[PDB]
C-alpha cells in the first residue's frame, strides 16, 4: 500500500502571557506517534504509540534537540509576519508548519511536501519538483527570496528525498503490527422511516483502519446517487475510525437499494440490501 | 522530524 | 570573528580557581550558540547549547555551569577548577533554526589548571 | 567511534594529491563538514555537504557517501600551508559531532 510520514507544527502568540505555545505532532498514514507541547512539564518530544518506545535515549534527545529549534523559528516569525501585515503587538496570531513522505508500495520516494501557513491562510509552499517555491503575496515573496538564497529547497529535499523516507522505512518495518495491520470494516444498517412515505438508511462502517474508505448507495441498476448524506470519517479513539452514509426513499421499495462499501482491508467490496 | 532545511521566514 | 568574538584568550590558573570566560556574537540574532572544548588531543567536544535567550542543555555531566543573560552574551564559568578543566574552549554559534549546520568559531579561550 | 578519522601525521609531498577520509555511525545523518584547524588557533570552515555526489571549491573536493558512510576530502596540488589538523564534523539532531581529526603535513 501506498504509506506517509508527516510532522505538524503550529505556534500561537499569547502577547503579555508567555512566549508562545507550541504543538508539535507526528503521524505515520494515519496514526500519531510522537508529539511535543511547549506547555507540558516534561519539555521532551514524548512517545504517542508502542513501537516507537522501542528507540534509545538518542534518539529522543535528536527529536528534541530538533523539535525545540522549530520552536524557536517560529518564535521569531510570530515577530517578523508582524512587521511584514503590520500588525499590532496585543492579540494572537498562529503560524502553522507541515512536512511529510509518501512512498508507494514498493516503498520508494513517490512525492515530498513542505508547506507553512499564518493566519490559518496559505503563505509558502515547496512545489512539486522539490526546487520551485509558491508564495501568496508580497510578504511570502521576501521569503521566498531570501530561502532562494539560502537553498533551503536543496536542504529540504535532502531530507525529504533521503532522511524522511528512511525512517519511514524503518517505523513500517518496526510498527508491523500496528502500521502494516489492515483491519476490515463491521457494517450494519439502520431503518429509520420519517412516517408516511419517507425512508432513510443509513450504512453504517465501523473499526477500521486506515481511514480512506468509500461507501455508496446504489439502486438496482444505475450506480450513482448525489441525494444523499454522510458524516466525515471520525475517529473512534481506539485507534480505527467510523463513518456512514445515509439516503431517502419511499417507504415501499425499502430492499431495491444496496450500500456497496470499497475500503483497502476488504478483499471483494462488500453490498448490503435491507434485513427483515 | 526535519535537521536542516527549517529557516525562519 | 568579525561576528564572534571571545575572551580572554589564555589562562593560567591555579586548582580550586574560579573561571569565568565571556562570549560576543554581533551580525545575526536569536542564534544558536555552543561551547564547545578541545581537550587532551584535538577533538571537539560539546559541552553546553542553547536554542535562545535564558535557555542552556548540558551534554556531559559536568564541573563547569554555563549561563545566558542576553541574546548574544554567552558565559561559561565554575566554582572551583579541577585538573581535569585545562583545554582549549571554542565558543560558536549557527543560524536561528536548523539550517546547514555551519559553525562559526571564536578565536578560542585557552586554559591550563595547575597545582 | 561515533566519528572515525585517522589521526597520526599523514605526509604528503608538495604539489601531490591529499586525501582525508572520515567516517560515522549513526545512519540519520544531514549534514558534513570539514573544518581546518591551524596550531593554536581557533577551526575554521573549509567545506559542508549534504548529498551523495562530489562537491569542489578550487584546491578542495568533499565526496559524500552515505551509503557507505564516509565523507572524503581531497586536497590537488598540496602547498606547506595547508599543514593543518582536518576536523571531520558530521550534523545528527541539530548537534554536529567531531572527529578527533587528521594531521596533514605538506613536506615541501
Known amino acids: 500500500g501506498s504509506h506517509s510520514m508527516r510532522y505538524f507544527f503550529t505556534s500561537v502568540s499569547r502577547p503579555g502571557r508567555g512566549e508562545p505555545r507550541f504543538i508539535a505532532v507526528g503521524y505515520v498514514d494515519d496514526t500519531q506517534f510522537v508529539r511535543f507541547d511547549s506547555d507540558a512539564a516534561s519539555q521532551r518530544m514524548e512517545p504517542r504509540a508502542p513501537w516507537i518506545e522501542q528507540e534509545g535515549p538518542e534518539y529522543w534527545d535528536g527529536e528534541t534537540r530538533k523539535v525545540k529549534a522549530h520552536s524557536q523559528t517560529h518564535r521569531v516569525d510570530l515577530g517578523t509576519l508582524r512587521g511584514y501585515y503590520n500588525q499590532s503587538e496585543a492579540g494572537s496570531h498562529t503560524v502553522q508548519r507541515m512536512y511529510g513522505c509518501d512512498v508507494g508500495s514498493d516503498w520508494r520516494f513517490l512525492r515530498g511536501y513542505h508547506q507553512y501557513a499564518y493566519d490559518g491562510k496559505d503563505y509558502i509552499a515547496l512545489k512539486e519538483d522539490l526546487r520551485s517555491w509558491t508564495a501568496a503575496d508580497m510578504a511570502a515573496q521576501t521569503t521566498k527570496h531570501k530561502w532562494e538564497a539560502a537553498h533551503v529547497a536543496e536542504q529540504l529535499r535532502a531530507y525529504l528525498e533521503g532522511t524522511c523516507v528512511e525512517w519511514l522505512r524503518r517505523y513500517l518495518e518496526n510498527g508491523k503490527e500496528t502500521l502494516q495491520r489492515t483491519d476490515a470494516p463491521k457494517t450494519h444498517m439502520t431503518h429509520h422511516a420519517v412516517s408516511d412515505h419517507e425512508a432513510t438508511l443509513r450504512c453504517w462502517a465501523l473499526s477500521f483502519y486506515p481511514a480512506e474508505i468509500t461507501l455508496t448507495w446504489q439502486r438496482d441498476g444505475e450506480d450513482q446517487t448525489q441525494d444523499t448524506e454522510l458524516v466525515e470519517t471520525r475517529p473512534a479513539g481506539d485507534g480505527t475510525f467510523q463513518k456512514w452514509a445515509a439516503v431517502v426513499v419511499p417507504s415501499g421499495q425499502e430492499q431495491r437499494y444496496t450500500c456497496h462499501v470499497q475500503h483497502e482491508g476488504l478483499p471483494k467490496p462488500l453490498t448490503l440490501r435491507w434485513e427483515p | 522530524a526535519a535537521g536542516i532545511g527549517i529557516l525562519t521566514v | 570573528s568579525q561576528t564572534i568574538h571571545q575572551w580572554p584568550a589564555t589562562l593560567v590558573q591555579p586548582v580550586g580557581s574560579p573561571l569565568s570566560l565571556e562570549c560576543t556574537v554581533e551580525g545575526t540574532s536569536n542564534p544558536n550558540l555552543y561551547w564547545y572544548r578541545q581537550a587532551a588531543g584535538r577533538g571537539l567536544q560539546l559541552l553546553f547549547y542553547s536554542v535562545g535567550i535564558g535557555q542552556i542543555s548540558s551534554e556531559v555531566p559536568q564541573n563547569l555551569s554555563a549561563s545566558r543573560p542576553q541574546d548574544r552574551q554567552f558565559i561559561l564559568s565554575s566554582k572551583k577548577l579541577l585538573l581535569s578543566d585545562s583545554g582549549f574552549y571554542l565558543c560558536?554559534?549557527?543560524?536561528?533554526?536548523?539550517?546547514?549546520?555551519?559553525?562559526?568559531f571564536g578565536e578560542g579561550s585557552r586554559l591550563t589548571v595547575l597545582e | 567511534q561515533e566519528v572515525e578519522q585517522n589521526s597520526g601525521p599523514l605526509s604528503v609531498p608538495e604539489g601531490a594529491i591529499a586525501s582525508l577520509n572520515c567516517t560515522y555511525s549513526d545512519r540519520g545523518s544531514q549534514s558534513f563538514f570539514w573544518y581546518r584547524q591551524y596550531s593554536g588557533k581557533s577551526p575554521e570552515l573549509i567545506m559542508f555537504?549534504?548529498?551523495?555526489g562530489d562537491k569542489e571549491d578550487g584546491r578542495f573536493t568533499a565526496q559524500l557517501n552515505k551509503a557507505s558512510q564516509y565523507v572524503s576530502l581531497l586536497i590537488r596540488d598540496s602547498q606547506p600551508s595547508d599543514s593543518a589538523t582536518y576536523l571531520c564534523?558530521?550534523?545528527?539532531?541539530?548537534?554536529?559531532?567531531f572527529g578527533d581529526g587528521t594531521t596533514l603535513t605538506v613536506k615541501p
Open positions: 560558536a554559534w549557527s543560524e536561528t533554526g536548523l539550517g546547514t549546520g555551519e559553525l562559526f
Open positions: 564534523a558530521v550534523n545528527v539532531a541539530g548537534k554536529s559531532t
Open positions: 555537504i549534504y548529498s551523495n
